[PDB]
Ligand binder design. Structure first.
Ligand SMILES: [Ca+2]
Ligand SMILES: [Ca+2]
Ligand SMILES: [Ca+2]
Ligand SMILES: [Ca+2]
Ligand SMILES: [Ca+2]
Ligand SMILES: [Ca+2]
Ligand SMILES: [Ca+2]
Ligand SMILES: [Ca+2]
Ligand SMILES: [Ca+2]
Ligand SMILES: [Zn+2]
Lengths: 48, 265, 397, 264, 132, 268
């Protein structure tokens, strides 16, 4: 609308909470799950 | 378990041991001035159909004294509340507390700022002498119309009250100053109604606002009122019409612990 | 369908009866039938396959009639017949597979393959021979709307379901009461358990009921009823109702009390058996209602009085049970059973030729899903494919 | 959310908490460090309990603790110090805090009371509970006692902080409790309280939480540890908090779906 | 059936006998211990009965996979047949009722006896493969 | 012959398969003093021979106290039976001794003047034995700073033992600790509980069954080798042991670690 006096780093302010929202946690969980799946030849068939 | 609360019940639109506590002020016993009146009432209740040993008689000195952590003992509770013109707020607070189900959490005012989340969130304070003073804080945690360090500037919302139900503006943090030595304050939420308890008001007009909302003043079936001139007549009325009072009430709301509120840490 | 069955029957009789040295009087009628078949089928062209991996095949018929001027068959006659028989058998095999691998939401009873539709013409009616087989007999009876009936040994009429109901329960799962059943194929095993052993129940009796409604009406069924549920009589760790935890079940088996087995049709008790175990007969029913009770023993030796206390720490949980097996039954509709192989044949053809999932049957011909939702269209298509599978099995083994 | 009704639950076979730790003052005395609560809080944090979720309650004795032992917490663990002369007191405390009791008032000066079944008991708590009982026959006359004279009554407790009394069922009694310093209630045992666990220190597993003489059940929530240092006791509790919690469970009365079933 | 299969075999064509409960499994009743000690107090392994037309297999672990990776213990059982079976209808059920009660078995070499007090859990990640 | 590997063992459920050892009996000096007979060991040897134990196979070991015996209880013997006298004030000492002699422990050294220590698992304890152990621990946060204690000053450490001949310390897992053991007299090792030791059985001669050999507070297992008897005469105690030696041996078993098939599995 107006960018009232001395608007801060709005992008960084948004990202600070965006990277902690639940969506970020879900993305991290998916990446960790895929990494573990690629890592766990030994488990073989230990995922439902 | 769930008791199947998450499951539906289908019904057809064509198909075809408990205990009774009577709370009364010491004034009633003093006026009766009989030592065997409790036995007499037990026998009259027996004629009505209440087994001997099922009716209990609890006595309190005043509404203010009884407001200090009231106890609900029987499967049915009937409280005879005497009307005083100067105690409308006290009667309303006591009736709210003992007619609604409350879920209260501890408050540590000396280490935290508190706020009321929703309209159901009140602050219930009980004790020998509760004196709650409040300081609202702006978004920068600075007092509005009050200096956070200095409590003399706070705004007084209760004074030496045995029971207070404080209602402050929702979403606004408050610093509280209370006499924790003679009072405990809890963050309570009104869960709903408590059909286990009924209040018969002897005396004046129909004055009981059990809702903090100013636009709502419900008068439930459990809020009865009578005109009195003799406590013997009052008790005869209660005994004779116990069936109607019980029909208005419902014993399933009985709690395990007899406290007026469910406490969660 | 009738003509295809006649082709298969004629070929089976040709392979069985046309052997070297046999008297010609042993075959004369079959030879007349076989020459009729050759005359009818000559000059027609058929195409089969093209669905899934089933190869496309083209069939042409130009054969000479088998001779009728011998006393005893010799090597020449058998050799001349065998080539024709082999070609016809391959043709029947491919027609049957092509018809089995097809289905339709609407008019599932009607022929679906081009070859069978062609055979349904009026020019091919001259080959009918005899519809002796059970499946073709029921096919004709159903077409006339007379009453059909298939006899099954251990019919598969109960979709696989293992479950439990908890009439009393708490978060700790220390004081449960309810039922626990497996229905599979032709067997029902139901156990009613109570952790308190009816200590506080009225008359020291806990009632248990289990209702199994069948998808089709079964007739003249022989049942085996036994007083224990062997499957539900050993320690188990079982997932909770919502799957958020596990509870422990440590049964002690008592005799079921006041056992009452009812076989009901349209809500009316057709057969009722009280406290009778072993072989029983249910003449006509569509629901099975098993009622039993756990009766706290009025008298106990010390070793039992110890097991069954008054307080909450119940270590042994009283359990009663019932087992019910349908040994043999009759149904108007087609079903899978232990003895036969029609479902296996159909599923085998579909799996072998990678037939895509169609609009009627569940993937892989999953019998559990099929019987669970046994719609009229599924019944029609299933009877069609089973009859075609029987026709095929007359020749292929 | 169909509260108040019991509906069968069908299941398929083929498929933020607070912890309270109650301890005797002797433990703190031996620890002789004023930062020990914060130390244990940080250790619990390592075990996964966020700071502020663990509360430490101190009681001076089993006697004092037995006077209306209110336990407000999602999980409660009570460290009970064994004394060979307090076996009954420990047993009564454990019975009161390991089970759910539904208690009704008793007016001894106005009614005669009898116990209806095995689940019914008389629980008396106060500074000094002295309970004397006179059984009455069907004619309302004392058996072995005289209702008018309380000296002839049979004494079943003396200066007890907490006492659970179990008289013969089906017979009325006249009670002579010291209501001035005691409150007696007619209670019925609904069932176990999964919220609470007891860890005895010392002794030899001496706890009868059942009035039945034929049973002395040892529930999973009743534990015992040999000890010489309270620091080692607390380290053991912290290190095995997971097992203790698994042994315990959330309070069924507390959980929603307990509404209209004696909630909380 | 038998004469026609005889003639088909002589003609060198495909034959087939249809069996209801074929006795294709040689009678075997035995166990294999993957983890074992002389005291037989902490065992992991499998037990099986292959008889007639039925296979009952039960994998047991005394520690309930407390120390196993991901708290999952894998069990396998391979039954080869002496002849190829075609178009077979099979019933697969999730519990081995034969290995669900207390037992006193004799050691592999017969020296001693060990105890088996089973508590039955649901089998996880059940895979049945038919191989040719 | 294929040592060090774990090959599956296959056996049959439907086949019928139709002395040399050495026993050591540990007892307190009180027993000998009460018996007051010089040839009592010879008499028991003859009775054991009657029961089937060749003479010279039964050893009689004497310890003065539970506290003294707890200092390195070396039991090298095919079968070991320890008669320990119950004392009301020594329940933890008895439990520690029973755990030490009834379970197998793999122990590594601990130089507390060079390293901080953390227990990584429920089976990892700190076992310290000697003339006088005084263990004082300081838990450290992630900055290697003491929690409730001062890393520099030992007097602020939290004490978990005082002049203990034997002690099994269990601290919160996963957190570093700085220890102040009195190493001048007592040695501490970082031990892991491999499992039960079948060689040894303990008979408590006295009070009730109080031993618990599991650090976990939720479990107090009472295994086969933990026996208990009442007594008024040590002669009666020894007669009972001799008469029921067969039952005791059946309850026990040969040490799994010392079996020649445990080579490369932490023994032989
Ligand atoms: Ca007020
Ligand atoms: Ca102001
Ligand atoms: Ca408000
Ligand atoms: Ca007397
Ligand atoms: Ca007491
Ligand atoms: Ca009683
Ligand atoms: Ca020690
Ligand atoms: Ca310190
Ligand atoms: Ca540890
Ligand atoms: Zn059969």
């Amino acid at each position: 609308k107006s960018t009232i006096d001395a608007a801060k780093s709005m992008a960084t302010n948004v990202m600070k909470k965006f990277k902690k929202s639940g969506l970020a946690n879900s993305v991290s969980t998916l990446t960790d799950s895929l990494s573990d799946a690629a890592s766990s030849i030994s488990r073989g068939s230990s995922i439902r | 378990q769930n008791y199947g609360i998450n499951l539906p019940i289908t019904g057809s639109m064509d198909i075809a041991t408990s205990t009774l506590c009577l709370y009364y002020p010491t004034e009633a016993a003093t006026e009766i001035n009989d030592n065997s009146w409790k036995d007499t009432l037990s026998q009259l209740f027996l004629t009505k159909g209440w087994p001997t040993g099922s009716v209990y008689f609890k006595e309190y000195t005043n509404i203010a004294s009884f407001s200090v952590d009231p106890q609900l003992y029987c499967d049915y509770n009937v409280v005879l509340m005497k009307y005083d013109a100067t105690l409308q707020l006290d009667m309303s607070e006591l009736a709210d507390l003992i007619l609604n189900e409350w879920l209260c959490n501890p408050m540590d005012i000396t280490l935290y700022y508190y706020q009321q989340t929703d309209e159901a969130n009140k602050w219930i304070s009980m004790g020998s002498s509760c004196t709650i003073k409040v300081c609202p804080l702006n978004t920068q945690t600075l007092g509005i119309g009050c200096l956070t360090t200095d409590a003399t500037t706070f705004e007084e919302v209760a004074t030496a009250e045995k029971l207070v139900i404080t209602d402050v503006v929702d979403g606004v943090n408050h610093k509280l100053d209370v006499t924790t030595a003679t009072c405990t304050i809890r963050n309570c939420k009104k869960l709903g109604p408590r059909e286990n308890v009924a209040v018969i008001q002897v005396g004046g007009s129909d004055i009981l606002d059990i809702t903090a909302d100013p636009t709502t003043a419900p008068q439930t079936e459990r809020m009865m009122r009578i005109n009195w001139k003799k406590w013997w007549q009052v008790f005869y009325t209660v005994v004779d019409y116990v069936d109607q009072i019980i029909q208005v009430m419902s014993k399933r709301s009985r709690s395990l612990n007899s406290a007026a509120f469910y406490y969660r840490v | 369908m009738d003509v295809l069955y006649s082709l298969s029957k004629t070929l089976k009789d040709a392979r069985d009866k046309i052997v070297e040295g046999t008297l010609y009087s042993n075959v004369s009628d079959l030879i007349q039938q076989f020459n009729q078949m050759i005359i009818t089928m000559n000059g027609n062209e058929f195409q089969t396959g093209g669905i899934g991996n089933l190869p496309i095949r083209n069939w042409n018929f130009n054969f000479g009639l088998l001779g009728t001027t011998l006393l005893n068959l010799d090597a020449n006659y058998v050799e001349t017949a065998r080539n024709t028989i082999d070609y016809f058998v391959d043709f029947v095999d491919n027609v049957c597979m092509d018809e089995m691998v097809r289905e339709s939401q609407r008019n599932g009873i009607a022929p679906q393959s081009d070859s069978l539709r062609k055979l349904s013409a009026i020019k091919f009616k001259r080959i009918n021979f005899d519809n002796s087989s059970e499946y073709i007999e029921n096919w004709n009876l159903q077409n006339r709307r007379q009453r059909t009936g298939f006899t099954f040994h251990k019919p598969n009429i109960f979709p696989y379901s293992a479950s439990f109901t908890l009439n009393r329960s708490q978060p700790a799962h220390d004081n449960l009461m309810g039922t626990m059943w497996l229905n599979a194929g032709s067997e029902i095993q139901v156990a009613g358990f109570d952790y308190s052993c009816a200590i506080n129940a009225p008359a020291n009796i806990q009632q248990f009921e289990h209702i199994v409604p069948l998808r089709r009406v079964l007739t003249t069924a022989t049942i085996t009823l036994l007083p224990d549920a062997e499957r539900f009589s050993f320690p188990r760790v079982i997932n909770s109702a919502d799957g958020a935890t596990t509870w422990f079940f440590n049964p002690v088996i008592l005799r079921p009390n006041n056992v009452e087995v009812e076989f009901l049709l349209n809500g009316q008790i057709i057969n009722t058996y009280q406290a009778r175990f072993g072989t029983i007969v249910a003449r006509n029913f569509d629901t099975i209602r098993l009622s039993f009770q756990l009766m706290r023993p009025p008298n106990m030796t010390p070793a039992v009085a110890v097991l069954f206390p008054n307080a909450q720490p119940f270590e042994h949980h009283a359990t009663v049970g019932l087992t019910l097996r349908i040994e043999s039954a009759v149904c108007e509709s087609v079903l899978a059973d232990a003895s036969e192989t029609l479902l296996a044949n159909v599923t085998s053809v579909r799996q072998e030729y990678a037939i895509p999932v169609g609009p009627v049957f569940p993937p892989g011909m999953n019998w559990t899903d099929l019987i669970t939702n046994y719609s009229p269209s599924r019944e029609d298509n299933l009877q069609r494919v089973f009859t075609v599978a029987s026709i095929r099995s007359m020749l292929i083994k």
